[PDB]
Design an enzyme around this catalytic site. Structure first.
Site, short mmCIF file in Angstrom:
data_model
loop_
_atom_site.label_atom_id
_atom_site.label_comp_id
_atom_site.label_asym_id
_atom_site.label_seq_id
_atom_site.Cartn_x
_atom_site.Cartn_y
_atom_site.Cartn_z
N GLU B 59 0.97 -1.19 0.05
CA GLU B 59 -0.12 -0.24 -0.35
C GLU B 59 0.85 1.58 -0.19
O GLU B 59 0.81 2.58 -0.81
CB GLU B 59 -0.76 0.29 1.19
CG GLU B 59 -2.02 -1.05 1.26
CD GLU B 59 -1.98 -2.39 1.57
OE1 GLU B 59 -0.47 -2.49 2.11
OE2 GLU B 59 -2.93 -3.17 1.52
N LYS B 171 -17.06 -0.80 7.23
CA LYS B 171 -17.94 -1.64 5.83
C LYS B 171 -19.55 -1.78 5.82
O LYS B 171 -20.12 -2.54 4.70
CB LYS B 171 -17.38 -3.63 6.60
CG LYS B 171 -17.62 -4.34 5.82
CD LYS B 171 -16.47 -5.69 5.97
CE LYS B 171 -17.29 -6.65 5.03
NZ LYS B 171 -16.53 -8.25 5.33
C1 LIG Z 1 -10.06 -14.00 9.96
C2 LIG Z 1 -10.10 -13.95 8.34
C3 LIG Z 1 -9.84 -12.68 8.06
O1 LIG Z 1 -11.05 -12.47 6.37
C4 LIG Z 1 -12.56 -11.66 6.59
N1 LIG Z 1 -12.69 -11.25 7.78
N2 LIG Z 1 -13.71 -10.30 7.67
C5 LIG Z 1 -14.21 -10.10 8.65
O2 LIG Z 1 -14.62 -10.16 9.91
N3 LIG Z 1 -15.31 -8.94 8.21
S1 LIG Z 1 -16.26 -7.94 8.98
O3 LIG Z 1 -17.05 -7.29 8.67
O4 LIG Z 1 -17.83 -8.70 9.57
C6 LIG Z 1 -15.57 -7.89 11.12
C7 LIG Z 1 -16.58 -7.88 12.21
C8 LIG Z 1 -15.60 -7.53 13.61
C9 LIG Z 1 -14.36 -7.21 12.92
C10 LIG Z 1 -13.85 -6.92 12.17
C11 LIG Z 1 -14.28 -6.64 10.66
C12 LIG Z 1 -13.87 -6.72 9.43
O5 LIG Z 1 -14.62 -6.23 9.09
O6 LIG Z 1 -11.98 -7.40 9.47
C13 LIG Z 1 -12.27 -7.21 8.65
C14 LIG Z 1 -13.53 -9.80 6.52
O7 LIG Z 1 -14.51 -8.96 6.00
N4 LIG Z 1 -13.00 -10.51 5.73
C15 LIG Z 1 -12.10 -10.91 4.55
C1 LIG Z 2 -0.72 -5.41 4.62
C2 LIG Z 2 -2.81 -5.64 4.46
N1 LIG Z 2 -3.07 -5.22 3.55
C3 LIG Z 2 -4.23 -5.75 2.99
C4 LIG Z 2 -4.21 -7.20 3.88
C5 LIG Z 2 -6.04 -7.96 3.92
N2 LIG Z 2 -5.84 -8.97 3.15
C6 LIG Z 2 -5.79 -9.35 1.90
C7 LIG Z 2 -5.14 -8.81 1.17
C8 LIG Z 2 -5.15 -11.07 2.15
C9 LIG Z 2 -4.57 -12.04 1.26
C10 LIG Z 2 -3.21 -13.15 1.23
O1 LIG Z 2 -2.49 -13.30 -0.34
P1 LIG Z 2 -1.50 -14.21 0.64
O2 LIG Z 2 -1.42 -14.67 -0.91
O3 LIG Z 2 -0.40 -13.60 0.85
O4 LIG Z 2 -1.87 -15.48 1.57
P2 LIG Z 2 -3.33 -16.53 1.01
O5 LIG Z 2 -3.63 -16.69 -0.50
O6 LIG Z 2 -2.30 -17.71 1.85
O7 LIG Z 2 -5.05 -16.13 1.57
S1 LIG Z 2 -5.26 -11.64 3.93
C11 LIG Z 2 -6.17 -10.19 4.08
O8 LIG Z 2 -6.11 -9.40 5.68
C12 LIG Z 2 -3.57 -7.13 5.18
N3 LIG Z 2 -4.42 -8.12 6.20
N4 LIG Z 2 -2.47 -6.64 5.12
#
Ligand SMILES: CCCOc1nn(C(=O)NS(=O)(=O)c2ccccc2C(=O)OC)c(=O)n1C
Ligand SMILES: Cc1ncc(Cn2c(C)c(CCOP(=O)(O)OP(=O)(O)O)sc2=O)c(N)n1
Ligand SMILES: Cc1cc2nc3c(=O)[nH]c(=O)nc-3n(C[C@H](O)[C@H](O)[C@H](O)COP(=O)(O)OP(=O)(O)OC[C@H]3O[C@@H](n4cnc5c(N)ncnc54)[C@H](O)[C@@H]3O)c2cc1C
Ligand SMILES: Cc1cc2nc3c(=O)[nH]c(=O)nc-3n(C[C@H](O)[C@H](O)[C@H](O)COP(=O)(O)OP(=O)(O)OC[C@H]3O[C@@H](n4cnc5c(N)ncnc54)[C@H](O)[C@@H]3O)c2cc1C
Ligand SMILES: Cc1cc2nc3c(=O)[nH]c(=O)nc-3n(C[C@H](O)[C@H](O)[C@H](O)COP(=O)(O)OP(=O)(O)OC[C@H]3O[C@@H](n4cnc5c(N)ncnc54)[C@H](O)[C@@H]3O)c2cc1C
Ligand SMILES: CCCOc1nn(C(=O)NS(=O)(=O)c2ccccc2C(=O)OC)c(=O)n1C
Ligand SMILES: Cc1ncc(Cn2c(C)c(CCOP(=O)(O)OP(=O)(O)O)sc2=O)c(N)n1
Ligand SMILES: [K+]
Ligand SMILES: [K+]
Ligand SMILES: [Mg+2]
Ligand SMILES: [Mg+2]
Lengths: 598, 598, 218
Positions: B59, B171
């Site tokens: 980023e 979100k």
């Molecule tokens: C631990 C799994 C990581 O993948 C994801 N979790 N997730 C989310 O958890 N989306 S969410 O609206 O329900 C949320 C709920 C509570 C606190 C934070 C979030 C959040 O926005 O996290 C990004 C979400 O949107 N993604 C892609």
């Molecule tokens: C700096 C940064 N940018 C964006 C994200 C959001 N993000 C992103 C873009 C993920 C995909 C990671 O891809 P990867 O190739 O490193 O691993 P996997 O393919 O095994 O999921 S996981 C996740 O939470 C993050 N966690 N950290």
């Protein structure tokens, strides 16, 4: 009065005083990067034999290295950077360290005091900027108060819940020479309350009534060397199954029958089931993060009912008052270091030989809820789950400690699930903030903390791409880290969510990868590439047998979900399980919707 | 009332509304990186043909790309990132943009409003953190106010002194659907005071008395298309020599006899001499930065004397009141857009045909103060100054615009000195904050803004190492940038200071470089390596003739100082000049002190 | 004016530099700036769930506060609810006047210096209907010991705490709500009340209530 003042620093520059205070704080490693504002300190540590200096390619690298060092060693990780962009580049690691309770002491150069507030050359308001991502920060304003500020920084970083602090060092302060005596207490680094003692006794009485107890253990238990020992002593004495957070992995020997493995969004459905049915939850150094509790209002129904009926509830051993009753009401709150309080707690707990019905349920849940997934088929690509198992099985063959760091994404979860965790401080991963790019520099820092350990970075290709320049740093530091990149050519964790919630609309989640073998060669790092099933075993062995930094690239199956999964908003026991037929149908749907592109 | 309300957005998600507002703001390029919190917006822009999306590896890359885009195009650079680490990773670019007056509009995903303040998964307090490095920020709290906040962001970013703004997007807000009508003025993007008019007349009277005038022009003159035209009109009419800041390079045609080149710490000693002797200084869109003024109390003696005697002084055309009388007292302050005010100013200025004595001095100073340096000798390495000249001379041969970005260090200064600057917005460099790693991503952004320009990144090896992963991004974006790495295997600008002020004690200022040719190959980028004098010309030609992204590595002389130099604390005309014998003695001293290691 | 009067009302400050207020407007401004100014699926479901919970209650109590006063129909709807479902009403210090204290259903003020009858009733209620009140520490007593019977009822799926609150910051800040009904309490009561079953008598509950009132005068 002469006895209370010290003159031994008189005649030294602020930089030389910094050097001396590092020694007195038993700092043996500094991670940093030079620049104009911090030159007086760099001149002072020039060719120092008193500690190892580690030079990254980027200050974010220094920050995550210091985090990895700190998590592996239990010592504060020390960062030394210049003003302006040098300082703002450490913000993500500081925020990371705050969320994960990592003791990080960041020293940032600053423009001379005469230039502060003038929008000076390479001036950032780092004290203002870093206020929300530090436990504490300060700008040293004269050289006489420099030893005091260094003491305060180390103390605050390492006590309570550990965390990052920042100390801003104006160039004229660190170049200035101390002319006056300073209090001798500033030149030197550094009982249970009636209330807590009563809470402990009450909590013991509550546990002695429990028929379905469970220990929910986290990172806090790792912040004392006797922690895991006392956790085991408690679980053995009262016959209690143990589950851990992602950050608690290694606190309890997962080979033990009492182990319920990891709980949470991607944890074992057996663990999630058990905590939803327990009448007594013993929370040891864990903060009830939203990745762990599932839907909060639906969390721990049986423990809530038990508390209302005076026969159970939640017993929370927590060092930071901010995290007590923040998410869930504790039936009893035991404030302070969990390990120290366990010493008082355990002798009040009744010894229990058997819990036939509870453990019958537990063992049944474990049998029906393994970490199942679709196995390889003839000609198929390697499954990412199988790769992790292969690495885990082979890594134990060595007579060495094994430390694992990760990036962020699916690979991180599969590492958590499929490694067998047995030792404290062997899982070094970004959990609270979840920073991609963390894996490689954290591994370098852990390897520096532990020169004789095998250090493995299980990394995603997108995560690894973020900080891959730090490969050169591993070579320059003499850190023989082992990087395994799971190449699925996707941001897997995001595409999993896009498959699930956005009808396979993959919006900008496929980045182009470099040739990782040529990249490794350019960095002077050994490169191994595994492309098919038949190369898996021998490839992983070459990887682990290497005595130099090494990059292993593995081509793995794409569009594979991490399961089990507790979807956002669902109760902790309302999870999705792996199913072969469902996966097959999901593939067909993805194929049709994307016109065969995926 | 029905005429004042708009219902056309009803039924859209916040994400879809974001997409529509981008269009209405004529955004044609977005730089960003996905993640959970910002998924609803990414779903909305999925396969949009309304703008180009550019995906970096990190980023910070997106941020600097957007800065480069903004500096090249004059449009705001738009960034789209997720919560937590996604957001904290853009802090350095925001701080960078603030210092250099770059219009950056950063949109960061945020955890749902129901989770804010709970130390949620991937939650950062980005509004708190980014407050000191933005003109303004805001967290959108419901979808109905989303169009308004987007309008405010773009307006604030592009008016006054341009700068970064951040808009935090929870979100649940971006996923929510608009159910109510909103004021139609929020769905659509957007005279001289008596006081200023009098100041202009007074300033014109002052200039009409001047016998030794000088124009000191900066970035502000570039923030209007007619800027450089009016600057030239003024200089021609009143017969005034013109000097520029680093950020003003290209505002005035340096081939013009009136050109005094760049002033400041590493600017022309002729320019520095002239401003110290001028009786009237016309400051056009420049902020008297401490790299430019030298010792402030000793700055512009002749202009101060003239003001006291009512026959001269400093005339400051400045749009931001904060920067008026911040560093030096203005004799007359002309507030507002410099270009617009020049339209009122110039007709009040008397036409002047000759200034024989002033221009005799000027021409003498120019003759005695060229950018001299030690030339190559037989068998010697290429001098970095000679390389820059070679690139500058050959780059003009093409019938295309040439845009230059840089990293930070000696190479940056030599680029400033030895290129011949002739066109506005062709010098894109990090000046205020001075961020290493800026060069490559800024070049990608500028190349996207200007698909038909030749875009050259003059980069140091240490700077380039910081963000070299973004090479893949250039390929993926189809941006045929030209990266030239000056490989001196050192942090040259820091070692210059260590040679000068710390007796050749090079403390941690020599990082190890990757093999840049193998690195390029791994990134799918053309690689050229120049190792000796005889390859310089043909190597640079291959570099410029390439029609694909290309990395040129040039092995250049080490331990070479940038001269002239005004040392910190010295008057702007108390400078060090290049001298062959001094350089030779300096080499001998360095050699002996380091035992021949350097 | 908008921010001060919407959500939970509160103070705002507008700083007026002397040169701004002395300066004269020379340019046109958006006409929308010269003029002052549906229930979500989620809330509608929470309301229905809350009504189902109240219809099971055997010992309900209304805990009413300042929020009910921020609408002219507030006290009217509070009374309509209490009359329909036959529910005793207690108020905070800031809710005084929201309910006619001469009414037999009135439990007077609760809290640190409130009626021991009111305090007793809320500690024994199986369903607490919080209307525009924020569970201040002058009111709850020892938080961990507050509303035992309502907590037990929630765990047993036959009661709990129903919190009608306009400010999300004050929802689940002090005590966990069994059902959280976000928005203006008065407006939400209009949706709530018709889903609530009419009740003519609660002999045992009101026998206790009337006994507590008799033994706990001021
Ligand atoms: C631990 C799994 C990581 O993948 C994801 N979790 N997730 C989310 O958890 N989306 S969410 O609206 O329900 C949320 C709920 C509570 C606190 C934070 C979030 C959040 O926005 O996290 C990004 C979400 O949107 N993604 C892609
Ligand atoms: C700096 C940064 N940018 C964006 C994200 C959001 N993000 C992103 C873009 C993920 C995909 C990671 O891809 P990867 O190739 O490193 O691993 P996997 O393919 O095994 O999921 S996981 C996740 O939470 C993050 N966690 N950290
Ligand atoms: C993609 C992704 C998925 C994730 N999914 C999961 C998941 O499924 N399961 C899971 O568990 N995690 C998951 N996480 C990680 C999760 O977000 C948290 O980081 C983690 O669960 C927190 O674990 P913790 O409470 O043990 O550690 P911490 O967050 O560090 O909290 C430790 C607690 O103990 C306290 N403490 C510290 N020291 C002491 C002491 N000496 N004595 C007493 N108390 C002390 C601290 O103050 C704190 O309250 C995921 C992360 C990512 C990036
Ligand atoms: C290693 C290094 C060395 C450096 N050495 C030098 C050096 O020797 N010489 C040098 O010049 N720089 C040098 N710098 C750069 C220096 O730090 C500043 O970044 C630069 O001088 C600022 O130039 P500026 O005032 O023109 O632009 P800015 O910093 O952007 O300031 C522009 C001014 O004009 C105002 N303005 C903006 N728009 C308008 C408008 N439309 N109308 C009126 N006013 C407007 C702004 O508010 C601001 O006050 C160096 C940087 C580095 C990293
Ligand atoms: C010496 C002293 C002793 C005290 N002792 C007591 C005592 O014994 N008993 C007692 O009750 N108080 C006592 N207090 C007062 C106590 O501190 C609080 O001020 C008071 O209890 C708060 O009452 P409240 O929650 O109804 O009002 P508020 O504090 O104003 O809270 C109102 C709640 O309703 C919400 N709300 C506002 N408008 C709406 C709407 N339109 N729709 C929905 N929700 C809305 C608000 O956001 C807020 O959450 C005492 C004060 C003092 C000085
Ligand atoms: C523009 C040249 C860059 O090289 C350097 N400049 N420089 C300095 O300028 N050092 S300095 O004390 O006098 C200073 C004075 C005013 C404002 C800022 C600073 C500063 O600390 O900058 C880092 C300094 O220490 N270095 C290495
Ligand atoms: C992110 C960051 N860190 C540190 C600095 C401090 N710094 C450093 C370390 C410089 C040396 C740059 O080395 P280079 O190889 O990129 O270029 P030169 O050798 O031509 O000087 S210049 C400078 O100001 C900086 N400007 N930015
Ligand atoms: K396991
Ligand atoms: K030039
Ligand atoms: Mg991947
Ligand atoms: Mg260099």
């Amino acid at each position: 009065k002469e006895q209370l003042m010290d003159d031994s620093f008189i005649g030294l520059t602020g930089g030389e005083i910094f050097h001396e205070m590092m020694l007195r704080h038993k700092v043996d490693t500094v991670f940093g990067y030079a620049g104009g504002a911090i030159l007086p300190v760099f001149d002072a540590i020039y060719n120092s034999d008193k500690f190892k200096f580690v030079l990254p390619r980027h200050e974010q690298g220094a920050g995550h290295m210091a985090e990895g060092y700190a998590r592996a060693s239990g010592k504060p990780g020390v960062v030394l950077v210049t003003s302006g962009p040098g300082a703002t580049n450490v913000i993500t690691p500081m925020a990371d360290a705050l969320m994960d309770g990592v003791p990080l002491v960041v020293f940032s150069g600053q423009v001379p005091t005469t230039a502060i507030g003038t929008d000076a050359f390479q001036e950032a308001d780092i004290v203002g900027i870093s206020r929300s991502c530090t436990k504490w920060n300060v700008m040293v304003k004269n050289v006489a108060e420099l030893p005091r500020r260094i003491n305060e920084a180390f103390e605050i970083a390492t006590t309570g819940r550990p965390g990052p602090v920042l100390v801003d060092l104006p160039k004229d302060v660190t170049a200035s020479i101390l002319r006056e005596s300073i209090p001798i207490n500033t030149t030197l680094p550094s009982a249970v309350s009636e209330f807590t003692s009563e809470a402990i006794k009450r909590a013991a009485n509550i546990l002695n009534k429990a028929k379905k107890p469970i220990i929910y253990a986290g990172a806090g238990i790792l912040n004392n060397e006797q922690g895991p020992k006392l956790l085991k002593e408690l679980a053995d004495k009262a016959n209690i199954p143990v589950t851990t957070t992602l950050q608690g992995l290694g606190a309890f020997d997962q080979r033990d029958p009492k182990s319920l493995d990891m709980l949470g969004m991607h944890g074992s459905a057996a663990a999630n089931t058990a905590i939803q049915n327990a009448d007594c939850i013993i929370a040891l150094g864990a903060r009830f993060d939203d990745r762990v509790t599932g839907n909060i209002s639906k969390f721990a129904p049986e423990a809530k009912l038990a508390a209302s009926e005076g026969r159970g509830g939640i017993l929370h051993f927590e060092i930071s008052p901010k995290n007590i009753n923040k998410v869930v009401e504790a039936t009893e709150a035991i404030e302070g270091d969990v390990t120290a309080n366990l010493q008082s707690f355990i002798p009040l707990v009744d010894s229990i030989e058997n819990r036939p019905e509870w453990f019958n349920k537990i063992n049944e849940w474990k049998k029906k809820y393994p970490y199942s997934y679709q196995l390889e088929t003839p000609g198929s690509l390697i499954k990412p789950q199988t790769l992790i198992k292969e690495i885990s099985d082979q890594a134990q063959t060595y007579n060495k400690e094994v430390i694992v760091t990760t990036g962020v994404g699916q690979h991180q979860m599969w590492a958590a699930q499929h490694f067998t965790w047995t030792q404290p401080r062997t899982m070094i991963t970004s959990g609270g903030l979840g920073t991609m790019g963390y894996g490689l520099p954290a591994a370098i820092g852990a390897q520096v903390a532990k020169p004789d350990a095998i250090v493995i970075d299980i990394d995603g290709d997108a995560s690894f791409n973020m900080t891959l320049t730090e490969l050169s740093s591993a070579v320059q530091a003499g850190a023989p880290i082992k990087v395994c990149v799971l190449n699925n050519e996707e941001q897997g964790m995001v595409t999993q969510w896009q498959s699930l919630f956005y009808e396979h609309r993959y919006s900008h989640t496929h980045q182009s990868n470099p040739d990782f073998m040529k990249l490794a060669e350019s960095m002077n790092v050994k490169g191994i590439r595994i492309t098919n099933q038949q190369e898996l075993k021998s490839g992983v062995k070459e990887f682990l047998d290497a005595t130099e930094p090494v990059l292993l690239e593995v081509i793995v199956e794409k569009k594979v979900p991490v399961l089990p999964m507790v979807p956002a908003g669902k109760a902790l026991d309302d999870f999705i399980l792996w199913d072969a037929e469902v996966e097959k149908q999901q593939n067909d749907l993805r194929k049709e919707r994307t016109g065969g592109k995926y």
